[PDB]
Swiss-Prot record:
Changing residue 80 to S: Retains only 20% decrease ATPase activity (in residues 72-480); probably due to loss of secondary structure. It comes from Mycobacterium tuberculosis (strain ATCC 25618 / H37Rv). This is ESX-1 secretion system ATPase EccB1. Residues 195-253 are annotated as: Structural repeat A2/3. ATPase activity inhibited by EDTA. Residues 111-172 are annotated as: Structural repeat C1/2. The lineage of its organism: Bacteria, Bacillati, Actinomycetota, Actinomycetes, Mycobacteriales. Residues 2-384 are periplasmic.
Amino acid sequence: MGTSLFTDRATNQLYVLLSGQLHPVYNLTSARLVLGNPANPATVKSSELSKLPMGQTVGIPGAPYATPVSAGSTSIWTLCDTVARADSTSPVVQTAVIAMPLEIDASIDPLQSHEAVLVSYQGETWIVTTKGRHAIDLTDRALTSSMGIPVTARPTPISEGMFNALPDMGPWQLPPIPAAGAPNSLGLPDDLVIGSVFQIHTDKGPQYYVVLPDGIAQVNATTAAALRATQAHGLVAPPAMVPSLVVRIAERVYPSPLPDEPLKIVSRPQDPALCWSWQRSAGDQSPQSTVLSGRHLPISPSAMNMGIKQIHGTATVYLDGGKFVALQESMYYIDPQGVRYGVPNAETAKSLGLSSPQNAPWEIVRLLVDGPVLSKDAALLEHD
Ligand SMILES: [Ca+2]
């Protein structure tokens, strides 16, 4: 009848009452687990512990001592790839995860819809925009130069977690023109064959169109340039057309991922930080995935002194206190050291006094060190 948890004065070790007699315990977490409620230990003179038929140690060894947690408000989760020696041989990428509010400026901001990051992963190159990653080839020497980028710009390494965090928004590459070259069946000049590009001067500059088998397709100047570079069909300049010719021809759509603006390949030495931010204010809404580029980590210079390089881990963890997170659900507790411990059922977390687990992206939380699983079965193992 108590009271069921005690601490010594000389050693301050935790003791829990089991049915009739007490057992010592590795951590407070295991005690609050085996009890089923978040109660605090009672400091006690060693002689009290002495005059008692003691059992032996139970609980979970590699479990966190306690389970403290910060607040929210926001559930911010960022994953940054910083790069050292961005012109070596022999380069190296230092990655990091952030679960604290960010300090975003103009030296580390999300990519504008015209700038992108050349990247390399598993022998195959990719390109990163605000949306995600797109497959690309840097071997076809001329094919690369068709869109702003040269070959004098080489890609740069990227971590696995970063690669898997970026949604594969397909490849770059202008869509296939299956009938390209065949006599145009729309009445236009025969030298303006299918797959050719022509221009019409509207009220806001010229407008470029590709001759498709089932009509004509509006494209941005970059797509026009790329198409012409691939195949111009014996045409020096895209033949100017006057509106009243195609004003009656069926208008069609041509995907083309190329931006209307020119392409600004960021300089990884001058812009080493490549991050993926994930947000959820409070309302249901949807997660807000955005890719950032910059000079440094999107946190305060002070926060840089909070980086816990995971000893047997993958990334440096920047963390403002403990977190209680829910994926998908599958729930986890993150200790201030940046280690995820599995929290099974909803009834279990009530013992640790944990409530309202924030939503967090599994893409980021999975990079955290997977510790033991906080369960009642695992917390019932005797040791000498
Ligand atoms: Ca920028």
